[PDB]
Amino acid sequence: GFEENVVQVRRVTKVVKGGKHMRFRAIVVVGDKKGQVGVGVGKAKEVVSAVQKAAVDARRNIITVPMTKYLTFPHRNEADYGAARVMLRPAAPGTGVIAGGAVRTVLEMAGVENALGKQLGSNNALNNARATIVAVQTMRQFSDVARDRGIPMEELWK
RNA sequence: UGGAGAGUUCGAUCCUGGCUCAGGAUGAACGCUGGCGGCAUGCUUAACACAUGCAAGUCGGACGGGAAGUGGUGUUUC
Fold first, then answer.
1. Which nucleotides of B are covered by protein (CB under 7 A)?
2. Nucleic strand B near CB of residue A52 (< 7 Å)
3. Long-range pairs for A74-78 at CB < 8 Å and ≥24 separation?
4. Euclidean distance between CA atoms A142 and A104, whole angstroms
5. Is A6 exposed, middle or buried, given 0-12, 13-18 or 19+ CB atoms closer than 10 A?
6. CA of A104 to C1' of B43 (A)
7. Structural domain A65-158, CATH architecture
8. Interatomic separation, CA of residue A54 and C1' of nucleotide B65, rounded (Å)
9. In angstroms, what CA-CA distances link A80 with A64, A119, A127, A129, A131?
């Protein structure tokens, strides 16, 4: 029971001496609004078959988003994947999802209803939709920072 | 409590990169149209040249007076 939506249907064509043929590509993102996303890129001859294969690749690369709070992000994070750079900042329980055309499509599925961002560098829908995934994977919460951090011998509780 | 972009240079892709558009604003003009009210505002172009009227006068409890107007029969006022 996951929600499915398309980002961009790109037209990629190569010319041979045998004519002009194309293999359509589509980016589909999945989600259940509880804090679970997954992007998928699939290439096929037709438009309907390119959306189908990208939906099967989306439910395979499943990553958990550690948001769980009052419909917002835990902290500030800046990640750069290639030429594309996206900045994700937390917001108050009244702001909408003021993020990019390829960024808002992955954030509405993550459960984050309150978020503010910017689209820097390259404005390609392929490199920016995956740059937000690398930025959401490196997200830490108050409990897992202290568990990642190796504190010395403190007083042990039962 | 604050920070959404997209189109176009390729057969096509990913970069770089210029250009263009969506917004708000402006003591604005033009075109079409046009019911009022409240508040604000109005040569931003020649500090160009200007008819007319008006925009600084007021005091006689500062004086010699009294040409007008009003009383009394000489004081207001001027």
1. 1-7, 11-16
2. no
3. A74/A139, A74/A140, A74/A141, A74/A142, A75/A139, A75/A140, A77/A135, A77/A138, A77/A139, A78/A135
4. 25
5. middle
6. 52
7. 2-Layer Sandwich (3.30)
8. 116
9. 20, 11, 10, 12, 7
Nucleotide at minimal C1' distance from the A83 CA:
B15
Burial of A93 (0-12, 13-18, 19+ CB in 10 A): exposed
What length is written for chain A?
A: 158
Q: Where are chain A's structural domains?
A: 1-64, 65-158
Resolution value, angstrom units = 9.4
Method: cryo-EM
End-to-end Cα separation, chain A, in angstroms: 40
